[PDB]
Subunit: 113 residues, 4 copies
């Protein structure tokens, strides 16, 4: 799979498990079309979102439902979600990593061949 | 009530001349333009709104990081950094949205204080 | 010439009353005490040193994050956050050391400006 | 192995390869005794630093030679290194992750069972 998402919890020092992830692809009329989705695993990872044949160049948005995650832990969060928006560019594998705190997050792209 | 501060993690400096657009979610669920501006030489953007106009709502702060890096000769990963949050739902607050930029990474933090 | 700013990423607030110790590497390669203080209600620590006393050297800023979290009922991962850097080796500069704290994570950024 | 170190490069969006890592354990006289060391792999990871039998409770310091890494890339860095200091506490595995930029770094502990 050319696109993987990994989420960590900076409060508990753990993978962020059961986080909902939605991927969108920008359409020609500038709307966001649903592309793929899932929930992070026990390791905080979401694999299998797409395939080399499907993941063509274009602008993609990855929406990480951080609010529901913090709500399930009983911790008041700031953001509605974390969104990562990027242009896929032709070999490359994309790992979108996110590090979550209730009032802060960071995201990093690890792009490898 | 709403300030944006942007730092450059490659140079260890404010990120100057960064375009910032703020949107507010409308009743029909679309993003309406709310305010815009660009960071100063200190990397801050002040004066976007007022206590009266900054009512409860869901707000989106779009920071044009890609143009910033491209003007410095770098092709970055992200199209922009987007910060989406509910504001003032417990009464008016002061919000500082901070962003720390690298070509393939950014972080964003909110500092929320009660006037 | 040297300021330290500390933010709490759990609460979205300045990190208040954080103890900070600064050390400078001596000629015998040991860490000598240089200055200390604690963050204010704004999460900043000003006045640690002066342009005259802040000579070239290798400096270490130790931020006592563990005591901060423990006083809030949290058992954090790190003993402290340590920021080590060469200062003023191209002439005097102004340094802001920023730290962003979570129980199992922190980040630190330097903003360096030329007077 | 109970202790793993992973390093990412936020400028290139890649693992940080060939980064020197030194681990120290605090001695009874408060000095730092060398404990283990190595260099990150092509995946930015350093495995095999210690064993369950050796990695007893105590205070450990992980020193990541960020300066030499940035110098080899030709980019002027701020820090001499990144140090992560923590008390190991009894099952647990420790992953020390670091995200490097020339004037900033973050470190996170992912502690799992
Ligand atoms: Mg092309
Ligand atoms: Mg209401
Ligand atoms: Mg000299
Ligand atoms: Mg015990």
């Amino acid at each position: 799979c050319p696109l993987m998402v990994k989420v960590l919890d900076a409060v508990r020092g753990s993978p962020a498990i059961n986080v909902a992830i939605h991927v969108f692809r920008k359409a020609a009329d500038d709307t966001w079309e649903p592309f793929a989705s899932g929930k992070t695993s026990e390791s905080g990872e979401l694999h299998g979102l797409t395939t080399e044949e499907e993941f063509v160049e274009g602008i993609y948005k990855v929406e990480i439902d951080t609010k529901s995650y913090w709500k399930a832990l009983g911790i008041s969060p700031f953001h509605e979600h974390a969104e990562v928006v990027f242009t896929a560019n032709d070999p490359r594998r994309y790992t979108i990593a996110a590090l979550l705190s209730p009032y802060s997050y960071s995201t990093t792209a690890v792009v490898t061949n």
